[PDB]
Amino acid sequence: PTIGMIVPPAAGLVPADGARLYPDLPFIASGLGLEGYDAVIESVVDHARRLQKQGAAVVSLMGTSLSFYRGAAFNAALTVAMREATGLPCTTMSTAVLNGLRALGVRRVALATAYIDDVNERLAAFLAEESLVPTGCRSLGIMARVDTATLVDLCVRAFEAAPDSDGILLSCGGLLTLDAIPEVERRLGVPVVSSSPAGFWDAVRLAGGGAKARPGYGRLFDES
């Protein structure tokens, strides 16, 4: 069943992880362009309707600011609005992350972002609203001169800030995320959830059938 994704850039490309994780599945995407919540809700609902018209069986909102920054209740209400607009099962990358952390038994979660501290602050408020425990946070600041090596280093530093954590949430970074995740899990013995990959994992479960991801991309993809 075709999975539709709402994406931040105007180009509306399927995020690059889908071809790595699920190369045999049909994905389409629609791009929004760019507390301006009024315009956000309306474009989200509009683009969900578009993906429905294009033949999506499920729709996921796939962007970071969009799914997390306005809180858990907002995330939940916008999901309902999309479902009412469209008549399809709808979800968001924030939900996918929550579903992923929960599947992996991660209550106490360290946060790692390539970007700035504010990314971690906002994800952490969302997660606490949903009754997870944010623990240590590290960021890099903001270009793709960051290698897998430094994505791995970042997560390890976030974790060492609170070695009692159950798992790690990695956000931003980007292309090299799916390479870092298994190294980090190997070195720490703790799972790592990353936003975009969790979005794909979650949207694939929502759609049904039991498609599995290609191997080598982390403990999450072993979760049904």
Swiss-Prot record:
Highest taxon of source: Bacteria
Catalytic reactions on record: 2-aryl-2-methylmalonate + H(+) = 2-arylpropionate + CO2
Keyword terms of this UniProt record: Decarboxylase, Lyase
GO molecular function annotation: arylmalonate decarboxylase activity
EC number: 4.1.1.76
Annotated coiled-coil segments of the chain: none
Protein's recorded name: Arylmalonate decarboxylase
